[PDB]
Amino acid sequence: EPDKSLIFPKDKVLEEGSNVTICLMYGQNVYNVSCKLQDEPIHGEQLDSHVSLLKLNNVVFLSDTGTNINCQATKGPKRIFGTVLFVSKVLEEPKNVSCETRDFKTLDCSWEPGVDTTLTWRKQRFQNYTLCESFSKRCEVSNYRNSYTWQITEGSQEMYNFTLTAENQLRKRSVNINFNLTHR
Amino acid sequence: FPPDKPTNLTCIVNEGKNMLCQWDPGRETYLETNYTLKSEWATEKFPDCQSKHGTSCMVSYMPTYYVNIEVWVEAENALGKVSSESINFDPVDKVKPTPPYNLSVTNSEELSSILKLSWVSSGLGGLLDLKSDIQYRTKDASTWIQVPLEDTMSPRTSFTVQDLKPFTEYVFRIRSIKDSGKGYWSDWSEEASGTTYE
Amino acid sequence: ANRGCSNSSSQLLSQLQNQANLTGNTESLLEPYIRLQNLNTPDLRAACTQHSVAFPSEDTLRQLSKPHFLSTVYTTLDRVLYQLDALRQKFLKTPAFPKLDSARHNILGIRNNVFCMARLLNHSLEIPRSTTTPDVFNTKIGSCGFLWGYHRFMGSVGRVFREWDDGST
Ligand SMILES: *[C@@H]1O[C@H](CO)[C@@H](O[C@@H]2O[C@H](CO)[C@@H](O)[C@H](O)[C@H]2NC(C)=O)[C@H](O)[C@H]1NC(C)=O
Ligand SMILES: *[C@@H]1O[C@H](CO)[C@@H](O[C@@H]2O[C@H](CO)[C@@H](O)[C@H](O)[C@H]2NC(C)=O)[C@H](O)[C@H]1NC(C)=O
Ligand SMILES: *[C@@H]1O[C@H](CO)[C@@H](O[C@@H]2O[C@H](CO)[C@@H](O)[C@H](O)[C@H]2NC(C)=O)[C@H](O)[C@H]1NC(C)=O
Ligand SMILES: *[C@@H]1O[C@H](CO)[C@@H](O[C@@H]2O[C@H](CO)[C@@H](O)[C@H](O)[C@H]2NC(C)=O)[C@H](O)[C@H]1NC(C)=O
Ligand SMILES: *[C@@H]1O[C@H](CO)[C@@H](O[C@@H]2O[C@H](CO)[C@@H](O)[C@H](O)[C@H]2NC(C)=O)[C@H](O)[C@H]1NC(C)=O
Numbered sequence: 191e192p193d194k195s196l197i198f199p200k201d202k203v204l205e206e207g208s209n210v211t212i213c214l215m216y217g218q219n220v221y222n223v224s225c226k227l228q229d230e231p232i233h234g235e236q237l238d239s240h241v242s243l244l245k246l247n248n249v250v251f252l253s254d255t256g257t258n259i260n261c262q263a264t265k266g267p268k269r270i271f272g273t274v275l276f277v278s279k280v281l282e283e284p285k286n287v288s289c290e291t292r293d294f295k296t297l298d299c300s301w302e303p304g305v306d307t308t309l310t311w312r313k314q315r316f317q318n319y320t321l322c323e324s325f326s327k328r329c330e331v332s333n334y335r336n337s338y339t340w341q342i343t344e345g346s347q348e349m350y351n352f353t354l355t356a357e358n359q360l361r362k363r364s365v366n367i368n369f370n371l372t373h374r
Numbered sequence: 375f376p377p378d379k380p381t382n383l384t385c386i387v388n389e390g391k392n393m394l395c396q397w398d399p400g401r402e403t404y405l406e407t408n409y410t411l412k413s414e415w416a417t418e419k420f421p422d423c424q425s426k427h428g429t430s431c432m433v434s435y436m437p438t439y440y441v442n443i444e445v446w447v448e449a450e451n452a453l454g455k456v457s458s459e460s461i462n463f464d465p466v467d468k469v470k471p472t473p474p475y476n477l478s479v480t481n482s483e484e485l486s487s488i489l490k491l492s493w494v495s496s497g498l499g500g501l502l503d504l505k506s507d508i509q510y511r512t513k514d515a516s517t518w519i520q521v522p523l524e525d526t527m528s529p530r531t532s533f534t535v536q537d538l539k540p541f542t543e544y545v546f547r548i549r550s551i552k553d554s555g556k557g558y559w560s561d562w563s564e565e566a567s568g569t570t571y572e
Numbered sequence: 573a574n575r576g577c578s579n580s581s582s583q584l585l586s587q588l589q590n591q592a593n594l595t596g597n598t599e600s601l602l603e604p605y606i607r608l609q610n611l612n613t614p615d616l617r618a619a620c621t622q623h624s625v626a627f628p629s630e631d632t633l634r635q636l637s638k639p640h641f642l643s644t645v646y647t648t649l650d651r652v653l654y655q656l657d658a659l660r661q662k663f664l665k666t667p668a669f670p671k672l673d674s675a676r677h678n679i680l681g682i683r684n685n686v687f688c689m690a691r692l693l694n695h696s697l698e699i700p701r702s703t704t705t706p707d708v709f710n711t712k713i714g715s716c717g718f719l720w721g722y723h724r725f726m727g728s729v730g731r732v733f734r735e736w737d738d739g740s741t
């Protein structure tokens with residue numbers, strides 16, 4: 191539209207320390223578009239006569255709500271338009287994963303969840319922890335973050351080979367443990 | 375034998391906690407008896423307060439001020455069910471404030487017979503106008519001399535005690551209550567010391 | 573029904589005035605929301621004050637009679653409750669924002685008080701959707717403007733209650 195402007199992408203989910211290139215396309219009547227971050231100027235490059243590119247290098251994590259990118263035009267229609275840039279932390283590997291038995295019926299395994307990488311809006315909500323054994327082929331999403339109560343089926347099987355997996359919308363970490371039933 | 379009608383239904387709201395209500399059961403029934411405390415507004419109902427042990431139970435919801443609330447307790451056993459009388463009160467008139475802290479006593483170089491007091495009060499973030507009661511005494515005497523309560527009726531955070539002996543130490547303590555005279559008197563604050571000027 | 577809101581009228585009026593003075597404060601809900609959404613830039617605050625939702629003005633409230641004023645207050649509080657419920661169902665984080673629940677309880681209390689006051693005057697009150705969001709900047713701006721308008725309306729209704737207490741005809 192000659193009296194409007196667009197910006198892409200909208201509500202991008204990135205990882206802390208990556209790059210991004212934001213495009214901005216304004217109409218014909220709009221002139222001298224100037225975009226800014228929270229509080230700083232941004233040196234934009236004009237790809238074409240009506241387009242402008244914004245380059246951000248090594249974005250830093252500010253808050254779990256995202257970094258607002260407000261862009262206001264000096265000439266033409268006086269208004270404010272922009273998008274929110276969601277930056278998330280790096281997912282860590284579970285540390286000191288160990289399990290135990292009490293009465294040959296349940297296995298209370300515990301681990302360290304690490305750093306929380308859950309956002310506030312509807313972008314990233316779940317951080318699942320899946321524990322799947324090899325000799326039995328059983329795994330379900332645990333309801334807790336650093337604990338789980340495993341139920342062993344009958345058969346007097348004395349062997350275990352687990353593989354804990356933590357996955358979010360960005361990456362997926364995995365750690366394997368190996369132990370014995372009578373030795374723990 | 376079946377229970378009797380409960381009485382002595384009173385409720386107190388501590389600053390920073392939920393509403394706590396107490397009553398007397400009466401006679402021993404020699405049977406398993408449950409006591410449930412009801413609570414509701416004029417247009418809304420609240421969860422029940424089931425006494426886990428004894429007669430008092432602490433509610434689970436947050437207290438809302440400036441709204442009349444009606445509560446009553448029902449006694450039920452294996453032989454009958456009887457409920458006490460209901461009371462209609464305001465949660466802001468049953469608040470028990472916390473004692474003021476950071477009590478400091480400062481002297482004056484010009485007037486050696488005065489001692490200016492200084493303290494801070496919570497007041498739920500500036501919501502309640504609290505009047506205070508100030509008691510002072512020397513270091514060797516055991517009795518406490520109380521200032522006239524009419525002089526400390528206005529909401530304030532400082533007071534100047536006069537008619538004191540020059541070059542003598544004193545001990546002070548304070549407690550606050552609502553301006554309208556309702557509610558409950560707070561506990562005594564920490565004793566602060568102060569020496570008059572020469 | 574008859575299990576609350578005793579026949580005392582001066583106490584009810586004082587409670588209403590105190591609730592209005594407590595609610596009509598920018599530090600209650602608007603300032604925490606602004607400090608949480610990273611909207612501290614002066615341009616962002618100008619955009620906040622620019623977009624304003626249409627609320628009844630002060631002269632309109634002062635020109636109306638008493639039952640009409642009570643009915644309009646009831647309807648406006650109902651709309652504010654609906655909008656707050658929508659914002660809660662869109663934000664999807666309850667523990668990081670208890671001011672929303674506090675304001676909701678305060679609005680419910682004000683609604684109960686005004687209903688009781690209307691019942692005391694022998695007047696009958698008038699008895700009467702997408703979770704996902706495409707954009708977030710526009711939603712933030714809209715919520716900011718709505719909170720600003722709500723605080724202004726609470727201040728206006730508090731001033732009207734004060735004028736009513738001064739009159740007492
Ligand atoms: C983000 O942009 C920077 C700057 O353009 C780039 O950093 C390059 O990283 C590679 C690999 O380490 C180096 O060989 C180059 O010398 C760096 N500079 C340039 C200009 O290419 C890269 O595109 C991105 N960096 C990261 C860490 O993601
Ligand atoms: C992480 O766990 C959640 C919660 O159990 C699951 O999310 C499901 O995702 C599927 C596919 O998108 C939906 O059909 C379901 O409605 C979601 N909820 C449930 C309860 O199943 C899923 O196991 C994992 N999701 C992600 C994104 O990793
Ligand atoms: C025990 O569990 C580990 C990890 O889950 C698995 O080891 C895999 O073994 C296969 C067979 O050689 C390899 O191709 C894979 O690379 C191994 N790693 C993974 C992550 O799959 C396997 O389930 C079990 N290993 C043994 C030796 O029994
Ligand atoms: C784990 O426990 C099982 C049984 O308690 C044992 O596994 C034995 O491993 C040896 C070495 O290969 C085999 O020769 C035996 O047949 C296995 N079974 C038994 C009953 O001895 C052993 O105690 C543990 N496993 C290992 C590899 O040490
Ligand atoms: C009714 O019973 C209550 C029992 O809760 C008593 O009232 C106060 O109870 C507290 C704690 O039990 C005591 O510390 C107070 O001394 C009691 N009296 C007052 C005036 O607070 C008392 O037995 C009865 N109250 C009345 C007013 O008769």
Ligand SMILES: *[C@@H]1O[C@H](CO)[C@@H](O)[C@H](O)[C@H]1NC(C)=O
Pocket residue numbers: 285286302
């Ligand atoms: C063992 O787990 C604990 C967590 O309670 C912590 O010390 C660490 O993650 C593990 N120990 C070492 C030496 O890594």
Ligand SMILES: *[C@@H]1O[C@H](CO)[C@@H](O)[C@H](O)[C@H]1NC(C)=O
Pocket residue numbers: 406407408450451452
């Ligand atoms: C009283 O409460 C207990 C739980 O403490 C419950 O088991 C019982 O059914 C209730 N009623 C009676 C009459 O005991």
Ligand SMILES: *[C@@H]1O[C@H](CO)[C@@H](O)[C@H](O)[C@H]1NC(C)=O
Pocket residue numbers: 476494
């Ligand atoms: C009260 O004194 C303590 C230390 O004595 C310190 O927190 C501060 O000086 C005062 N606190 C407040 C809230 O005034």
